[PDB]
């Protein structure tokens, strides 16, 4: 997952 994921709501 993780990529798909830290982007998603919490950098964008």
């Not at 798909?4 to 964008?12: D, S, T, V, W």
Request: net charge positive; hydrophobic share 40%; proline share 0%.
């Amino acid at each position: 997952e993780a990529h798909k994921n830290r982007k998603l709501m919490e950098i964008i």
